[PDB]
Ligand binder design. Structure first.
Ligand SMILES: COc1ccc([C@H](C)N)cc1F
Ligand SMILES: COc1ccc([C@H](C)N)cc1F
Lengths: 237, 300
């Protein structure tokens, strides 16, 4: 059924699975028209599909041309997400296909379920966790490939960089969620934290800086401090 | 006007005949129901005084044979039987009538209720939902499950309603996923109407027989079937005008006839609020919406 804090270690077992986040598929800037009305103008988006055990990210870029001439775009976006996830699955060798897909928003359950009727042995599950995958467009290299895209496109990343050489998936997912939560609560400060001194740099093939073990502790501490603060700055405590 | 003679009434029982009910006491001299209008199906049903568990009953058409009821003390129920000897039956009924031991189907002349609830119900289709082919009449009870239900355990005693499932390949054309799921016109008109039911009269027949089994026996899977068939029409952008008009009338009479105290278990909030207020046909069920608001405004 639903995914929550009690069955949290299931993510890191040996059953292949993906999270699907659709929060950045349909993105608009709202603006005034000459006549003083309001209009939306869409910008490129992406489906965030992630293997939490390996870190493989399948970033499907949603080009604005897909919305041309379409009505009810927030509802179309959930079905477009589901069409693209199901195609991704179909494109994978059977032994690489997921046993479960966990959607971060319950409104994706029906669309994905309907697109996956051919896969009756793939479980589509919601979650009660409040995962910060919306902050994925706060990651500079991801935001870049999306905004530069002139056509539909799939790009593959490892969101854990090389972390798994040194830490468990459980720890790697926890660092990722912490960085993303931080980027979501106060993007500026989180970004200030990350590239504090030029000696630590981002390798061409990575998303995040190359920190030592000892430097990731300092960073993780600064991200927690940030997150507890903004919670103060917000509820005054 | 036809007759169903009862060998006797050895156990105290509430007897229903279509939308009416009456009480019989243990060993009261009682030998039947007379003046049953010809030309409709009927249902005669039973709730024992000692065990309100298991309502049960028989669907039947007097044009198809001479039927009677005799209590079976082994199986502990009033059973319907067919008497094949025409003049033995006439002679049995005539003596019951002369001794004035039969109650009279009290049809008020103004009253089209039973016609309106059974307009499209036909015995031949009832016998295909309720498979028991040695008999011309069909037994149903509270606990019988549906074919779809058993997919999720005795097949001989199932209700073989037409399986409807909105998240199925039958219902959803490859490459039309969003289209077919939000507008069920394909599944209604091509799959069900043209393919499976052949015409809208057969579809309405099943819908009406589901509602009646739900109301008279509190058959939970019948109620699921009734709501499912309603929702499929309401969620279809394209429905023949004549089907919508008839549906409004069909539902109006079901809702009119439902006991006011059974509405909590037998009416599905989501389905009704969706059909009346959100669906494509939200504006096509004027009579049904007016009675539903004046009678069950709580549910909505
Ligand atoms: C009560 O009506 C009947 C009772 C008994 C019989 C037969 C002779 N078993 C037939 C009937 F039509
Ligand atoms: C079919 O015979 C009857 C039907 C209904 C009643 C009352 C009005 N409950 C009494 C009957 F004798």
């Amino acid at each position: 059924g639903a995914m929550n804090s009690s069955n949290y270690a299931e993510l890191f077992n040996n059953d292949i699975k993906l999270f699907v986040d659709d929060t950045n598929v349909y993105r608009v800037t709202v603006h005034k028209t000459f006549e003083g009305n309001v209009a939306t103008k869409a910008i490129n988006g992406c489906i965030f599909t992630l293997n939490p055990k390996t870190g493989h990210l399948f970033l499907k870029i949603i080009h604005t041309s897909v919305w041309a001439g379409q009505k009810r775009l927030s509802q179309l976006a959930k079905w477009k997400t589901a069409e693209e996830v199901s195609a991704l699955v179909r494109s994978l060798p059977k032994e690489e296909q997921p046993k479960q897909i966990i959607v971060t928003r319950k409104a994706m359950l029906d669309p994905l379920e309907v697109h996956m009727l051919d896969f009756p042995n793939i479980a589509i599950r919601p979650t009660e966790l409040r995962l910060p995958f919306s902050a994925a467009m706060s990651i500079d290299k991801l935001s870049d490939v999306v905004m530069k895209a002139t056509e539909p496109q799939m790009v593959l990343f490892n969101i854990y960089d090389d972390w798994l050489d040194r830490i468990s998936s459980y720890t790697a997912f926890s660092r990722l969620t912490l960085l993303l939560r931080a980027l979501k609560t106060n993007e500026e400060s989180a970004k200030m934290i990350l590239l504090s001194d030029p000696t630590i740099t981002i390798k061409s093939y990575h998303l995040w800086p190359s920190f030592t073990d000892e430097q990731w502790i300092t960073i993780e501490s600064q991200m927690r401090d940030l997150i507890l603060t903004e919670y103060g700055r917000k509820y005054n405590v | 006007m036809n007759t169903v003679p009862f060998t006797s009434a050895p156990i105290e029982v509430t007897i229903g005949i279509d939308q009416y009910s009456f009480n019989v006491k243990e060993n009261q001299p009682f030998h039947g129901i007379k003046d049953i209008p010809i030309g409709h199906v009927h249902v005669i049903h039973f709730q024992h005084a000692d065990n309100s568990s298991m309502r049960y009953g028989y669907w039947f058409d007097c044009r198809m044979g001479n039927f009677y009821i005799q209590y079976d003390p082994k199986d502990g129920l009033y059973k319907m039987m067919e008497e094949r000897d025409g003049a033995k039956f006439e002679n049995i009924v005539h003596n019951f009538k002369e001794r004035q031991m039969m109650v009279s189907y009290p049809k008020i002349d103004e009253d089209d209720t039973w016609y309106n609830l059974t307009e499209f119900v036909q015995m031949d289709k009832i016998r295909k939902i309720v498979r028991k082919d040695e008999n011309q009449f069909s037994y149903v009870d509270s606990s019988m499950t549906t074919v779809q239900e058993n997919e999720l355990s005795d097949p001989a005693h199932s209700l073989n309603y037409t399986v409807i499932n909105f998240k199925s390949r039958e219902a959803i054309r490859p490459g039309h996923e969003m289209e077919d799921f939000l507008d069920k016109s394909y599944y209604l008109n091509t799959v069900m109407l043209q393919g499976i039911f052949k015409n809208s009269s057969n579809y309405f027949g099943e819908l009406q027989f589901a509602f009646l089994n739900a109301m008279f026996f509190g058959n939970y899977g019948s109620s699921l079937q009734w709501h499912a068939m309603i929702e499929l029409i309401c969620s279809s952008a394209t429905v023949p005008k004549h089907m919508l008009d008839k549906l409004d009338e069909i539902l109006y009479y079901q809702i009119k006839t439902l006991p006011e105290q059974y509405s909590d278990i037998l009416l599905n909030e989501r389905v009704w609020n969706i059909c009346l207020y959100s669906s494509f046909q939200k504006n096509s069920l004027h009579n049904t919406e007016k009675i539903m608001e004046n009678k069950y405004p709580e549910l909505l």
